């Protein structure tokens, strides 16, 4: 069994659960076009691409579509980026990691002044050494790209003390190209089949599964 010392986490669908901000967001912009839907038929829309959404499921037209993300946006500054939950035992496995002297890291796509407010919500933000995203209104960064970023920011030396916590391929797939190990998780948005076939080092079904590998 290996000993990390540097534990690096996704932060949608691993830390924290977007759902209710990002369906409440595409609800009140279908809503800007007089489009009624419930949230619940909403939920497949968490993870595309908002293009896809709108131009491939709604059909909107490029112009029509960028106005789409406009409002979007709009109600995701005001109100959706509050709009999460943690995920259960979350805290309780953190203050562990903690407590027990691992440097704990943010590695994600979502722009970094959304996951550091999400963080700071949640009161977690504290356990975090650094948190790294994309920037706002900027390109959505590769995974790859902020595992590396992240990790120069600690001057790491010894990788094999170093892994990787997510639920989606991207973060697994990510991993692996910088030569770190990784935990896939099951709990978020990726699916077992995804998991399985991205052959991340562990596969976990729920968050206190986490402390039987790292602790
Ligand atoms: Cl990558
Ligand atoms: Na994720």
Redesign the pocket.
């Given at each position: 069994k290996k000993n990390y010392e540097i534990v690096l986490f996704?932060?949608?669908?691993?830390l924290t659960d977007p759902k209710e901000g990002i369906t409440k967001s595409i609800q009140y912009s279908l809503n800007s076009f007089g489009i009624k839907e419930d949230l619940e038929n909403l939920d497949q829309f968490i993870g595309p691409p908002l293009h896809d959404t709108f131009k491939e499921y709604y059909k909107f037209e490029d112009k029509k579509a960028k106005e789409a993300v406009e409002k979007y946006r709009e109600y995701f500054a005001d109100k959706g980026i509050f709009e999460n939950k943690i995920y259960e035992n979350m805290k309780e496995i953190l203050e562990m990691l903690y407590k027990n002297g691992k440097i704990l890291l943010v590695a994600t796509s979502k722009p970094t002044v959304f996951a550091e407010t999400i963080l700071r919500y949640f009161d977690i933000d504290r356990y975090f050494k650094y948190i790294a995203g994309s920037n706002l209104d900027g390109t959505r960064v590769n995974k790859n790209e902020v595992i590396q970023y992240v990790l120069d920011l600690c001057n790491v030396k010894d990788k094999d003390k170093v892994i990787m916590v997510?639920?989606?391929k991207y973060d697994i797939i990510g991993a692996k190209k910088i030569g770190i190990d990784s935990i896939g998780v099951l709990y978020?948005?990726g699916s077992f089949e995804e998991i399985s076939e991205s052959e991340p080092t562990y596969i976990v079904e729920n968050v206190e599964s986490i402390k039987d590998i790292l602790l």
């Open positions: 996704d932060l949608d669908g691993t997510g639920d989606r978020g948005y």
